[PDB]
Amino acid sequence: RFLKVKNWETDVVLTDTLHLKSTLETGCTEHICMGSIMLPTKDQLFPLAKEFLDQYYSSIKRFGSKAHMDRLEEVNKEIESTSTYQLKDTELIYGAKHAWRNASRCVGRIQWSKLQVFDARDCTTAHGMFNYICNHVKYATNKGNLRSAITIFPQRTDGKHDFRVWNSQLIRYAGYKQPDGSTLGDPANVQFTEICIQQGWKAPRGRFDVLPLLLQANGNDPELFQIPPELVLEVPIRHPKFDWFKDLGLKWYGLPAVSNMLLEIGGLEFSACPFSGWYMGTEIGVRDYCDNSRYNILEEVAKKMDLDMRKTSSLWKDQALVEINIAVLYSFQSDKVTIVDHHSATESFIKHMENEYRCRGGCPADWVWIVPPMSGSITPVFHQEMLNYRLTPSFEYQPDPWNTHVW
Amino acid sequence: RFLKVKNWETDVVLTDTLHLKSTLETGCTEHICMGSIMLPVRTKDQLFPLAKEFLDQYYSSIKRFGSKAHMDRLEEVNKEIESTSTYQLKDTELIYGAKHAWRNASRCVGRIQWSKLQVFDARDCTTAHGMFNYICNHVKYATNKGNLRSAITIFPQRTDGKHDFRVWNSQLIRYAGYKQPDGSTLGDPANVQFTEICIQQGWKAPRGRFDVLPLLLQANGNDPELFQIPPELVLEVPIRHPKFDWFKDLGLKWYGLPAVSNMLLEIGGLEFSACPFSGWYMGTEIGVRDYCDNSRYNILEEVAKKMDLDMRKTSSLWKDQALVEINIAVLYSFQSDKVTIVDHHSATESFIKHMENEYRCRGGCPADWVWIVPPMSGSITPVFHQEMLNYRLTPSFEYQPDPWNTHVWKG
Ligand code: HEM
Ligand code: HEM
Ligand SMILES: N#Cc1cccc(CNCCc2ccnc(-n3ccnc3)n2)c1
Ligand SMILES: N#Cc1cccc(CNCCc2ccnc(-n3ccnc3)n2)c1
Ligand SMILES: C[C@H](O)[C@H](O)[C@H]1CNc2nc(N)[nH]c(=O)c2N1
Ligand SMILES: C[C@H](O)[C@H](O)[C@H]1CNc2nc(N)[nH]c(=O)c2N1
Ligand SMILES: [Zn+2]
C-alpha cells in the first residue's frame, strides 16, 4: 500500500504515501478502470471540519495545540447551533490554495501557493457579484502580466440560495446557429449564447463576441452584465512566417477563468468560486481552434498552406496543427500577454511532482488530462507514471444551473 | 450492471455489458486509479474451471453450447487433467484462443483485424534449431514481399515452469545497441542490455547503427542458442522525405515487420511463454517513439538543425515541427516501397468503427485510452474524444519477466 511511480525516460522512481489519506471514490474498481471517463447534515459536517482543521493546524506546526483544540470545540459548537459554520480568513486562503494543489487535472499546479484569494462572502446581489468579478478580472489580467486569482462567494446554505456564475468561464466567445445548419462563433456555447439572447443580450452575431456575464446571487433569477471591454484583454493571432495568417481574422482572450466549478473546504460548499491562471498554448491552438466540435479551422488553414489534403497520410492536419500553435504562442508573446508552451509547462509539472513527492509524500495526477493534446510523447509527462486519487479540499464539477434553477 | 461510454465529439453513447465477464484485476481500487502505470507451475486445483470457462466460450462461439460434442469435450479435458495434471487444446481451440487473445488486447489499436490472423502451430517443436526454422517461416510468410499479413507462431505450453520455451528477443527483428566507453550509444539504446547478452553468447557484432540482432532462442528450458535470420528474409526501408532531399543523408532506415516475441499467451489456463506475433506498423511507432523518444535514436536535434529551425527556444515548437516531418518521411518511404503501413489518423478512425461494432455485437470492447491515443497529435484523432473502459478478459496476452532474470543456467 506504499505505491511507487516510475518515469520511463529517466528511470526515476517516487514512492507515494499521500494517497492513503484520500477519502472520496475514483469510479474505478478492481475489475474495471474508468480513467478515461470525463465525469466520474449536522452529523456529516463535523468530521469533515475536523479533518480539515487537523491538516490546517498540522500545516502550521501547532497540531494538538490549545488553539487547535479550541478552534475544534468552537467549530463543533457552531455546527451544533447553526447546522453550519464559518471559516476564518486564514483557513479560507489555505483551503483554496490546497484545492488547487489537489486538482489532479491541472498541469499548472507548481504555482499553487502563489494564489490571490478574494473573499467575497459579504456579497448579497448580482450587481455586487459583477463588481467583485470586474475587480478579479482587472487584477488577474494586470495589463497582460497575469496573476493567479480566485474570488469566493458565500457558501451554500439550504441549496435554494446558491450563488452561481452561469458562464462556464468568465470570458468566452458567443456561438450562433445559422440558417444553413452551420455554426458561427463558438459551438460549445451555442446553448448559453441562446440563453443570454433569450434574456435580452443584443448579439453582435460575429465570429468572436465576448459573452455577457449571467450572475445568480442567493438563488434569485440571473442578471446580465457586460464586462468593460477595456478589462477584456484580447490577442490578434498572426504567424511569424505566414503573412496571410493575419487574414484568417482570428483572435483569443488572454484570461482563462473557470467559473462553473464547486469548491469544497472542510465540508462547506462554495458553488460560486471563479478562478483564473494563464493559458497553456495548446488549450487555444489545439483544442479551441482545431477540435472538430469547436472552431474547427484545420481545413481552412491547410487550404491557405496549399497542402495535399487528399490523403490523411500526408499528415497535412499535423502540419497545420503545429503552425497554428506556433502562431498562438507568437501572438501572445509579441503582445506581452503571459502564456506557457506545452514543453515548458510539462517540464515544470515534472519538477513540481518531484517537489510534492519530497515534501508531501505524493501528488495526485490524471495522466489523461496532464498529457498535452499534441506532441504527447515528446513531453516528459508522457513517460511519467501518475497515481490519481481525490483529496480534499477540492474543486468538483456541478450541474449546469439552467437544468436545476427553480426559474 | 450496465456502463455507458460517451464520445464527446459525436455524443454517441455506447453501453458495456461485457465487463461483467472480466475476472482478472486491473490494479485500480475505489480509492486509486492506476490507469497510467506501465506494469501494474500452476496446479490442477485451479486449472479445470479455467479450462471449462474457455471451453464454454468456444462452444458458444460456434453455436454448440450444451451439445454432446461440448459435453464430451469437457469430460475429456477433465479426465486428462487429473490423469496428466494438464491438457492439450485441439487445433480449432488454439486458433480461436489466439484470435481472442488479440481481440481482448486492450492496448492494441489494430484490433479491427483480429479475425484475420494466421496461426502457426509449433507445439511439436523440441529444439532451438526447430524454433529458428519455425520463426524463419513466420517472417517469410508475414512479410510477403511487403504485403504484410498478421500471424502468430505458438510453441509448446509451460509444464512445470522448468522446461519453458522462450524467445529472448523482445521483438523478432530489432537493431543492436552498443554503449561506448565515453557514455554515448551506438544504435538503439533500448537494446543495449540484450545486445550485450548476445555478444557474450558469441555474437560477432558489426557494431553499426542498424545491425539486425540475432535470434536468441530457448527450447524446453535448455540454455538459449544464437541464430542469424537470413538477411534476404529481413525487409528494410531506407527513410527519405518527399520534399527534403538532405533527409536521406541522415542514413536512417527501419525494418518492415513489427513482431512482438516476449509476451505470454494464456488460453483455458494453459500458458504459452513463446508465442511471437506480428501485424504491421502504425507510422508513429517508428517516427515518434523509435526515432524521437529521448531514450531511443533521438534524432529531433539533428533533424531540426538540418531544417534550420529556431532551436533557441521551445516556444518556436521546433521539436513539434521536426517530429511531423519525420513522421511524414516514414509514411512516405514505406508507401513508396509498397511496404504495408498505416497512419495514425486512418488507424484510430478504424478502431472507433471496430469499437462501435464490438459494443453492438459483443457488448463491449476493453480499451486502454493511455495506450490507444497516438503519441503525437492526440486530440485531432477521434480516440482522444472517446471514453473507454479498461478491463481484462481471457484469452489474453500478458507480460512476463525477462528470461535472463529467471533462467537456470545448465552451463
Ligand atoms: C496559473 C497557471 C495555470 C495553468 C498553466 C493551468 C493549466 C491547466 C490546464 C492546461 C488544464 C486543462 C484544462 C482543460 O484541458 O480543460 C487545467 C485544468 C484545471 N485547473 Fe489549472 N492552470 C493554471 C491555474 C489554475 C488555478 C489558479 C486553479 C485554481 C485555483 C486551477 C485549477 C484547475 C482545475 C480544478 C482544473 C480541472 C478543470 C476541469 O476539470 O475542467 N488552475 N489547468
Ligand atoms: C495488424 C496490424 C496491427 C497494428 C497496426 C497494431 C497496432 C498496435 C500498436 C500501435 C500498439 C502499441 C505498441 C506500443 O506502443 O508499444 C499495439 C500493441 C499491442 N498489440 Fe497490436 N497491432 C497490430 C496487430 C497485432 C496482432 C496480430 C496482435 C496479436 C496477435 C496484436 C496484439 C497486441 C498486443 C498484445 C499489444 C500490447 C503490447 C504491449 O503491451 O507491449 N497486435 N498494437
Ligand atoms: N464539466 C466539464 C468540463 C469538461 C471538460 C472540459 C471542461 C473545461 N475545463 C476547463 C477549461 C479551462 C478554460 C479556461 N481556463 C481554464 N483554466 C484556467 C486555469 N486552469 C484551468 N480551464 C469542463
Ligand atoms: N513491458 C513493456 C513494455 C513497455 C513499453 C513498450 C513495450 C513494447 N510494446 C510493443 C511494441 C511493439 C513492437 C513491435 N510490434 C508491435 N506490435 C505488433 C503488433 N502490435 C504491436 N509492438 C513493452
Ligand atoms: C474521453 C477523454 O477522457 C476526454 O476526451 C478527455 C481526454 N483528456 C483531456 N485532457 C484535457 N486536458 N482536457 C480535456 O478536455 C480532455 N478530455
Ligand atoms: C507512464 C505511461 O503510462 C507510459 O509512458 C505509456 C503511455 N502510453 C503509451 N502508449 C503506447 N502506445 N506505448 C507506450 O509505450 C506507452 N507508454
Ligand atoms: Zn483506474
Side-chain angles (χ1 to χ4, degrees), chain A residues 8-9 25-26 28-33 36 38 286 291 312-314 318-319 323 326 333 341-343 367 373-377 385-386 388-389, chain B residues 3 8 25-26 28-31 33 36 38 288 294-295 314-316 320-321 325 328 335 343-345 375-379 385 387-388 390-391:
Chain A
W8 287 84
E9 184 191 347
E25 297 182 338
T26 66
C28 297
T29 85
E30 319 86 41
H31 292 66
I32 181 160
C33 177
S36 71
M38 187 92 70
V286 183
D291 257 25
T312 66
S313 342
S314 72
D318 309 76
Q319 224 158 14
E323 298 303 336
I326 284 175
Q333 288 173 145
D341 71 82
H342 52 285
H343 302 290
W367 196 100
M374 75 179 270
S375 308
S377 68
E385 292 182 345
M386 302 167 191
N388 196 23
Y389 49 92
Chain B
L3 297 175
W8 286 82
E25 292 179 332
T26 65
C28 312
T29 70
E30 289 72 23
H31 301 128
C33 174
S36 69
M38 181 92 71
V288 189
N294 284 333
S295 306
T314 69
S315 339
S316 66
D320 310 73
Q321 225 161 9
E325 298 308 328
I328 284 186
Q335 288 163 353
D343 70 78
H344 50 288
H345 300 288
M376 69 178 284
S377 308
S379 75
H385 304 277
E387 286 178 353
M388 303 174 194
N390 194 25
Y391 47 90

Coordinates of all heavy atoms in Angstrom, one line a residue, chain A residues 8-9 25-26 28-33 36 38 286 291 312-314 318-319 323 326 333 341-343 367 373-377 385-386 388-389, chain B residues 3 8 25-26 28-31 33 36 38 288 294-295 314-316 320-321 325 328 335 343-345 375-379 385 387-388 390-391:
Chain A
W8 N 9.7 6.5 -17.1 CA 10.3 5.5 -18.0 C 11.4 6.1 -18.9 O 12.2 5.3 -19.6 CB 9.3 4.8 -18.8 CG 8.5 3.8 -18.0 CD1 7.4 4.1 -17.2 CD2 8.8 2.4 -17.8 NE1 7.0 3.0 -16.6 CE2 7.8 1.9 -16.9 CE3 9.7 1.5 -18.3 CZ2 7.8 0.6 -16.5 CZ3 9.7 0.2 -17.9 CH2 8.7 -0.3 -17.0
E9 N 11.5 7.4 -18.9 CA 12.6 8.1 -19.7 C 13.8 8.3 -18.8 O 14.9 8.3 -19.4 CB 12.0 9.5 -20.2 CG 12.9 10.3 -21.1 CD 12.4 11.7 -21.3 OE1 11.3 12.0 -21.0 OE2 13.2 12.5 -21.8
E25 N -14.3 8.6 -3.7 CA -14.1 7.5 -4.6 C -13.6 7.9 -6.0 O -13.9 9.0 -6.5 CB -15.4 6.6 -4.7 CG -15.7 6.0 -3.3 CD -16.9 5.1 -3.4 OE1 -17.8 5.3 -4.3 OE2 -17.1 4.2 -2.5
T26 N -13.0 7.0 -6.8 CA -12.5 7.3 -8.1 C -13.4 6.9 -9.2 O -13.4 7.5 -10.3 CB -11.1 6.5 -8.4 OG1 -11.4 5.1 -8.5 CG2 -10.1 6.8 -7.4
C28 N -13.3 3.9 -10.3 CA -12.7 2.6 -10.7 C -13.0 1.5 -9.7 O -13.5 1.8 -8.6 CB -11.1 2.7 -10.8 SG -10.6 3.9 -12.1
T29 N -12.7 0.3 -10.1 CA -12.8 -0.9 -9.2 C -11.6 -1.9 -9.5 O -10.8 -1.5 -10.4 CB -14.1 -1.7 -9.3 OG1 -14.0 -2.6 -10.4 CG2 -15.3 -0.7 -9.5
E30 N -11.6 -3.0 -8.9 CA -10.5 -4.0 -9.2 C -10.8 -4.6 -10.5 O -9.9 -5.2 -11.2 CB -10.5 -5.1 -8.1 CG -10.6 -4.6 -6.7 CD -12.1 -4.5 -6.2 OE1 -12.9 -5.3 -6.6 OE2 -12.4 -3.4 -5.6
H31 N -12.0 -4.6 -10.9 CA -12.4 -5.2 -12.2 C -12.5 -4.3 -13.4 O -12.4 -4.7 -14.5 CB -13.8 -5.9 -12.0 CG -13.8 -7.0 -11.1 ND1 -13.6 -6.9 -9.7 CD2 -14.0 -8.3 -11.3 CE1 -13.6 -8.1 -9.2 NE2 -13.9 -9.0 -10.1
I32 N -12.5 -3.0 -13.2 CA -12.6 -2.0 -14.3 C -12.0 -0.7 -14.0 O -12.3 0.0 -13.0 CB -14.1 -1.9 -14.8 CG1 -14.2 -1.0 -16.0 CG2 -15.0 -1.5 -13.7 CD1 -15.4 -1.2 -16.8
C33 N -11.2 -0.2 -15.0 CA -10.6 1.2 -14.9 C -11.5 2.1 -15.7 O -11.7 1.9 -16.9 CB -9.2 1.2 -15.4 SG -8.5 2.9 -15.4
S36 N -10.5 7.0 -18.3 CA -10.8 7.9 -19.4 C -12.2 8.4 -19.4 O -12.6 9.1 -20.4 CB -10.5 7.1 -20.7 OG -11.5 6.1 -21.0
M38 N -14.9 11.1 -18.5 CA -14.8 12.6 -18.2 C -15.4 12.9 -16.9 O -14.8 13.6 -16.0 CB -15.5 13.4 -19.3 CG -15.3 14.9 -19.2 SD -13.9 15.4 -20.2 CE -14.6 15.2 -21.8
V286 N -4.7 24.0 -30.0 CA -5.1 22.6 -30.3 C -6.6 22.4 -30.1 O -7.3 22.0 -31.1 CB -4.3 21.6 -29.5 CG1 -4.7 20.2 -29.9 CG2 -2.8 21.8 -29.7
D291 N -10.2 21.4 -32.4 CA -11.3 20.4 -32.1 C -12.3 20.5 -33.2 O -12.7 21.6 -33.6 CB -11.9 20.8 -30.7 CG -11.4 19.9 -29.6 OD1 -10.3 19.3 -29.7 OD2 -12.2 19.8 -28.6
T312 N -4.9 11.3 -45.7 CA -4.6 11.6 -44.3 C -3.1 11.3 -44.1 O -2.4 12.0 -43.3 CB -5.4 10.7 -43.4 OG1 -5.1 9.3 -43.5 CG2 -6.9 10.9 -43.6
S313 N -2.6 10.4 -44.9 CA -1.1 10.0 -45.0 C -0.1 11.2 -45.1 O 1.0 11.0 -44.7 CB -0.9 9.0 -46.1 OG -2.1 8.4 -46.5
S314 N -0.6 12.3 -45.7 CA 0.3 13.4 -45.9 C 0.6 14.1 -44.6 O 1.5 15.0 -44.5 CB -0.2 14.4 -46.9 OG -1.3 15.1 -46.4
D318 N -1.5 17.5 -39.1 CA -0.5 17.6 -38.1 C 0.4 18.9 -38.4 O 0.7 19.6 -37.5 CB 0.4 16.4 -38.2 CG -0.4 15.1 -38.1 OD1 -1.0 14.7 -39.1 OD2 -0.4 14.5 -37.0
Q319 N 0.6 19.1 -39.7 CA 1.5 20.1 -40.1 C 0.8 21.5 -39.8 O 1.5 22.4 -39.3 CB 1.8 20.0 -41.6 CG 3.3 20.2 -42.0 CD 3.7 19.6 -43.3 OE1 2.8 19.2 -44.1 NE2 5.0 19.5 -43.5
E323 N 1.8 24.8 -37.0 CA 1.8 26.2 -37.4 C 0.9 27.0 -36.6 O 1.2 28.1 -36.1 CB 1.6 26.3 -38.9 CG 2.6 25.7 -39.8 CD 4.0 26.1 -39.5 OE1 4.2 27.3 -39.0 OE2 4.9 25.4 -39.8
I326 N 2.1 27.5 -33.2 CA 3.2 28.5 -33.3 C 2.7 29.9 -33.2 O 3.2 30.7 -32.4 CB 4.0 28.3 -34.6 CG1 5.0 27.0 -34.5 CG2 4.9 29.5 -34.9 CD1 5.7 26.7 -35.7
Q333 N 3.1 36.3 -27.0 CA 4.4 36.7 -26.6 C 4.7 38.1 -27.2 O 5.2 39.0 -26.5 CB 5.5 35.8 -27.1 CG 5.5 34.5 -26.3 CD 6.5 33.5 -27.0 OE1 7.1 32.7 -26.2 NE2 6.6 33.5 -28.3
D341 N 4.1 27.5 -23.2 CA 4.1 26.4 -24.2 C 4.0 25.0 -23.5 O 4.4 24.9 -22.3 CB 5.2 26.4 -25.2 CG 6.6 26.1 -24.5 OD1 6.8 24.8 -24.4 OD2 7.3 27.0 -24.2
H342 N 3.5 24.0 -24.2 CA 3.3 22.7 -23.6 C 4.6 22.0 -23.1 O 4.6 21.2 -22.2 CB 2.5 21.7 -24.5 CG 3.1 21.6 -25.9 ND1 2.9 22.6 -26.8 CD2 3.8 20.6 -26.5 CE1 3.5 22.3 -27.9 NE2 4.1 21.1 -27.8
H343 N 5.7 22.4 -23.7 CA 7.0 21.9 -23.3 C 7.4 22.4 -21.9 O 7.8 21.7 -21.0 CB 8.1 22.1 -24.3 CG 7.8 21.5 -25.7 ND1 7.8 20.2 -25.9 CD2 7.4 22.1 -26.9 CE1 7.4 20.0 -27.2 NE2 7.2 21.1 -27.8
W367 N -3.1 11.5 -15.7 CA -2.3 11.3 -16.9 C -3.1 11.7 -18.2 O -2.6 12.4 -19.1 CB -1.8 9.9 -17.0 CG -0.7 9.7 -18.0 CD1 0.6 9.6 -17.8 CD2 -0.9 9.5 -19.5 NE1 1.3 9.3 -18.9 CE2 0.4 9.3 -20.0 CE3 -1.9 9.5 -20.3 CZ2 0.7 9.1 -21.3 CZ3 -1.7 9.4 -21.7 CH2 -0.4 9.2 -22.2
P373 N -2.6 17.8 -25.7 CA -3.3 17.2 -26.8 C -2.5 17.2 -28.1 O -3.1 16.8 -29.2 CB -4.5 18.0 -26.9 CG -4.1 19.4 -26.4 CD -3.1 19.1 -25.3
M374 N -1.3 17.7 -28.1 CA -0.4 17.5 -29.2 C 1.0 17.1 -28.8 O 1.4 17.4 -27.6 CB -0.3 18.7 -30.2 CG 0.5 19.9 -29.6 SD 0.6 21.3 -30.8 CE 2.0 20.9 -31.7
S375 N 1.7 16.3 -29.6 CA 3.1 16.0 -29.3 C 3.3 15.3 -28.0 O 4.4 15.6 -27.3 CB 4.0 17.3 -29.4 OG 3.8 18.0 -30.6
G376 N 2.4 14.5 -27.6 CA 2.4 13.8 -26.3 C 3.7 13.2 -25.8 O 4.2 13.6 -24.8
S377 N 4.3 12.4 -26.6 CA 5.5 11.6 -26.2 C 6.8 12.4 -26.3 O 7.8 11.9 -25.9 CB 5.6 10.3 -26.9 OG 6.0 10.5 -28.2
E385 N 4.7 7.8 -15.0 CA 3.6 7.2 -14.4 C 3.0 8.2 -13.3 O 3.7 8.9 -12.7 CB 4.0 5.9 -13.7 CG 4.4 4.8 -14.6 CD 4.7 3.5 -13.9 OE1 4.9 3.6 -12.7 OE2 4.8 2.5 -14.6
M386 N 1.6 8.2 -13.2 CA 1.0 9.1 -12.2 C -0.1 8.3 -11.5 O -0.9 7.5 -12.1 CB 0.4 10.3 -12.9 CG 1.4 11.2 -13.7 SD 0.5 12.4 -14.8 CE 1.9 13.0 -15.8
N388 N -3.7 8.6 -9.6 CA -4.9 9.6 -9.5 C -5.7 9.2 -8.3 O -6.1 8.0 -8.2 CB -5.7 9.6 -10.8 CG -6.6 10.9 -10.8 OD1 -6.3 11.8 -10.1 ND2 -7.7 10.8 -11.6
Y389 N -6.1 10.2 -7.5 CA -6.9 10.0 -6.3 C -7.5 11.3 -5.9 O -6.9 12.4 -6.2 CB -6.2 9.3 -5.2 CG -4.8 9.8 -4.9 CD1 -4.6 10.8 -3.9 CD2 -3.7 9.3 -5.5 CE1 -3.4 11.2 -3.5 CE2 -2.4 9.8 -5.2 CZ -2.2 10.7 -4.2 OH -1.0 11.2 -3.9
Chain B
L3 N -22.8 -0.2 -18.1 CA -22.0 1.0 -18.1 C -22.0 1.7 -19.4 O -22.1 1.1 -20.5 CB -20.5 0.7 -17.7 CG -20.4 0.1 -16.3 CD1 -18.9 -0.3 -16.1 CD2 -20.8 1.1 -15.3
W8 N -17.2 12.4 -26.9 CA -17.6 13.8 -26.6 C -17.5 14.7 -27.8 O -17.7 15.9 -27.7 CB -16.6 14.4 -25.5 CG -17.0 13.8 -24.2 CD1 -16.6 12.6 -23.6 CD2 -17.7 14.5 -23.2 NE1 -17.1 12.5 -22.4 CE2 -17.8 13.6 -22.0 CE3 -18.4 15.7 -23.1 CZ2 -18.5 13.9 -20.9 CZ3 -19.1 16.0 -21.9 CH2 -19.1 15.1 -20.8
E25 N -7.7 -8.8 -12.3 CA -7.8 -7.5 -11.6 C -7.1 -6.4 -12.5 O -6.2 -6.7 -13.3 CB -7.1 -7.5 -10.2 CG -7.9 -8.4 -9.2 CD -7.2 -8.4 -7.8 OE1 -5.9 -8.3 -7.8 OE2 -7.9 -8.5 -6.8
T26 N -7.5 -5.2 -12.3 CA -7.0 -4.0 -13.1 C -5.8 -3.4 -12.5 O -4.9 -2.8 -13.2 CB -8.1 -2.9 -13.3 OG1 -8.4 -2.3 -12.1 CG2 -9.3 -3.5 -13.9
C28 N -6.6 -1.1 -10.1 CA -7.2 0.1 -9.5 C -8.1 -0.3 -8.3 O -8.3 -1.5 -8.2 CB -8.1 0.9 -10.5 SG -7.3 1.3 -12.1
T29 N -8.4 0.6 -7.5 CA -9.4 0.4 -6.4 C -10.4 1.5 -6.4 O -10.4 2.4 -7.3 CB -8.7 0.4 -5.0 OG1 -8.2 1.7 -4.7 CG2 -7.5 -0.6 -5.1
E30 N -11.3 1.5 -5.4 CA -12.3 2.6 -5.3 C -11.6 3.9 -5.0 O -12.2 5.0 -5.1 CB -13.3 2.2 -4.2 CG -14.3 1.1 -4.6 CD -13.6 -0.3 -4.6 OE1 -12.6 -0.4 -4.0 OE2 -14.2 -1.2 -5.3
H31 N -10.4 3.8 -4.5 CA -9.7 5.0 -3.9 C -8.5 5.4 -4.7 O -7.9 6.5 -4.4 CB -9.4 4.8 -2.5 CG -10.6 4.5 -1.6 ND1 -10.8 3.4 -0.8 CD2 -11.8 5.2 -1.5 CE1 -11.9 3.5 -0.2 NE2 -12.6 4.5 -0.6
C33 N -6.7 5.3 -8.9 CA -6.7 4.8 -10.3 C -5.2 4.7 -10.8 O -4.5 5.6 -10.7 CB -7.4 5.8 -11.2 SG -7.2 5.4 -13.0
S36 N -2.4 4.8 -15.5 CA -1.1 5.2 -16.2 C 0.1 4.4 -15.8 O 1.2 4.7 -16.2 CB -0.9 6.7 -16.1 OG -0.5 7.2 -14.8
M38 N 2.6 1.5 -16.0 CA 3.0 0.6 -17.2 C 2.8 -0.9 -16.9 O 2.2 -1.6 -17.8 CB 4.5 0.9 -17.5 CG 5.0 0.1 -18.7 SD 4.7 1.0 -20.3 CE 5.9 2.3 -20.1
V288 N 7.7 8.5 -34.2 CA 7.6 9.3 -32.9 C 8.4 8.6 -31.8 O 9.3 9.2 -31.2 CB 6.2 9.4 -32.5 CG1 6.1 10.4 -31.3 CG2 5.3 10.0 -33.6
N294 N 13.5 10.5 -26.4 CA 14.9 10.9 -25.9 C 15.8 9.7 -25.6 O 17.0 9.8 -25.7 CB 14.8 11.8 -24.7 CG 14.3 13.2 -25.0 OD1 14.6 13.8 -26.1 ND2 13.7 13.9 -24.0
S295 N 15.1 8.6 -25.2 CA 15.8 7.4 -24.7 C 16.0 6.4 -25.9 O 16.5 5.3 -25.7 CB 15.1 6.8 -23.6 OG 14.9 7.7 -22.5
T314 N 12.0 26.7 -26.9 CA 11.0 25.7 -27.1 C 9.7 26.2 -27.7 O 8.9 25.5 -28.4 CB 10.6 24.9 -25.8 OG1 9.9 25.8 -24.9 CG2 11.9 24.4 -25.1
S315 N 9.4 27.5 -27.4 CA 8.2 28.2 -27.8 C 8.1 28.3 -29.4 O 7.0 28.6 -29.9 CB 8.1 29.6 -27.2 OG 8.9 29.7 -26.1
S316 N 9.2 28.1 -30.1 CA 9.1 28.1 -31.5 C 8.4 26.8 -32.0 O 8.0 26.7 -33.2 CB 10.5 28.1 -32.1 OG 11.2 26.9 -31.8
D320 N 8.2 20.0 -32.2 CA 6.9 19.6 -32.8 C 7.0 19.6 -34.3 O 6.5 18.7 -35.0 CB 5.8 20.6 -32.4 CG 5.8 20.7 -30.9 OD1 6.7 21.4 -30.4 OD2 4.9 20.2 -30.2
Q321 N 7.6 20.7 -34.9 CA 7.8 20.8 -36.3 C 8.6 19.7 -36.9 O 8.2 19.1 -37.9 CB 8.3 22.2 -36.7 CG 7.6 22.9 -37.8 CD 7.8 24.4 -37.8 OE1 8.6 24.9 -37.1 NE2 7.0 25.1 -38.7
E325 N 7.6 16.3 -39.8 CA 8.4 16.0 -41.0 C 8.9 14.6 -41.0 O 8.9 13.9 -42.0 CB 9.5 17.0 -41.2 CG 9.0 18.4 -41.4 CD 7.9 18.6 -42.5 OE1 8.0 17.8 -43.5 OE2 7.1 19.4 -42.3
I328 N 6.2 12.2 -41.6 CA 5.8 12.3 -43.0 C 6.8 11.4 -43.8 O 6.4 10.7 -44.7 CB 5.9 13.8 -43.5 CG1 4.7 14.5 -43.0 CG2 6.1 13.8 -45.0 CD1 4.6 15.9 -43.5
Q335 N 5.3 3.7 -48.1 CA 4.3 3.6 -49.2 C 5.0 3.5 -50.5 O 4.6 2.8 -51.5 CB 3.4 4.8 -49.2 CG 2.3 4.8 -48.1 CD 1.7 6.1 -47.8 OE1 2.1 7.1 -48.4 NE2 0.7 6.2 -46.9
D343 N -1.3 5.2 -41.2 CA -1.0 6.5 -40.5 C -2.0 6.5 -39.2 O -3.0 5.7 -39.2 CB -1.3 7.7 -41.4 CG -2.7 7.9 -41.7 OD1 -3.5 8.4 -40.9 OD2 -3.1 7.5 -42.9
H344 N -1.6 7.3 -38.3 CA -2.4 7.4 -37.0 C -3.8 7.9 -37.2 O -4.7 7.6 -36.3 CB -1.7 8.1 -35.9 CG -1.2 9.5 -36.4 ND1 -0.1 9.7 -37.2 CD2 -1.6 10.7 -36.0 CE1 0.1 10.9 -37.4 NE2 -0.8 11.6 -36.7
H345 N -4.1 8.7 -38.2 CA -5.5 9.1 -38.4 C -6.3 7.9 -38.9 O -7.4 7.6 -38.3 CB -5.5 10.3 -39.4 CG -4.7 11.5 -39.0 ND1 -5.2 12.3 -38.0 CD2 -3.6 12.0 -39.5 CE1 -4.3 13.3 -37.8 NE2 -3.3 13.1 -38.7
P375 N 1.0 8.9 -29.9 CA 1.9 9.7 -29.1 C 2.2 11.1 -29.8 O 3.1 11.8 -29.3 CB 3.2 8.9 -29.1 CG 3.1 8.1 -30.5 CD 1.6 7.8 -30.6
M376 N 1.5 11.4 -30.9 CA 1.5 12.8 -31.4 C 0.1 13.2 -31.8 O -0.7 12.3 -32.1 CB 2.5 13.0 -32.5 CG 2.1 12.3 -33.9 SD 3.2 12.5 -35.2 CE 2.8 14.2 -35.8
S377 N -0.2 14.5 -31.9 CA -1.5 15.0 -32.5 C -2.7 14.3 -31.9 O -3.7 14.2 -32.6 CB -1.5 14.7 -34.0 OG -0.3 15.3 -34.6
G378 N -2.6 13.9 -30.6 CA -3.7 13.2 -29.9 C -5.1 13.7 -30.2 O -5.9 12.8 -30.6
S379 N -5.4 14.9 -29.9 CA -6.8 15.3 -30.0 C -7.4 15.6 -31.4 O -8.6 15.9 -31.6 CB -7.1 16.5 -29.1 OG -6.6 17.7 -29.6
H385 N -11.2 11.6 -27.9 CA -12.5 12.1 -27.6 C -13.4 11.0 -27.2 O -14.6 11.2 -26.8 CB -13.1 12.9 -28.7 CG -12.2 14.1 -29.1 ND1 -12.2 15.3 -28.5 CD2 -11.4 14.2 -30.1 CE1 -11.4 16.1 -29.0 NE2 -10.8 15.5 -30.1
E387 N -14.5 8.1 -24.7 CA -14.4 7.4 -23.4 C -14.2 5.9 -23.6 O -14.8 5.3 -24.5 CB -15.6 7.6 -22.5 CG -15.7 9.1 -21.9 CD -16.9 9.3 -21.1 OE1 -17.8 8.5 -21.1 OE2 -17.0 10.4 -20.4
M388 N -13.3 5.3 -22.8 CA -13.1 3.8 -23.0 C -13.1 3.2 -21.6 O -12.7 3.8 -20.6 CB -11.7 3.6 -23.7 CG -11.6 4.2 -25.0 SD -9.9 4.1 -25.7 CE -10.0 5.3 -27.0
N390 N -11.5 0.0 -19.4 CA -10.4 -1.0 -19.5 C -10.7 -2.1 -18.4 O -11.0 -1.8 -17.3 CB -9.1 -0.3 -19.2 CG -7.9 -1.2 -19.5 OD1 -8.0 -2.1 -20.4 ND2 -6.7 -1.0 -18.9
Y391 N -10.6 -3.3 -18.9 CA -10.8 -4.5 -18.1 C -10.1 -5.7 -18.7 O -9.7 -5.6 -19.9 CB -12.3 -4.8 -17.8 CG -13.2 -4.8 -19.0 CD1 -13.4 -5.9 -19.7 CD2 -13.9 -3.6 -19.3 CE1 -14.3 -5.9 -20.8 CE2 -14.8 -3.6 -20.4 CZ -15.0 -4.8 -21.1 OH -15.9 -4.8 -22.2

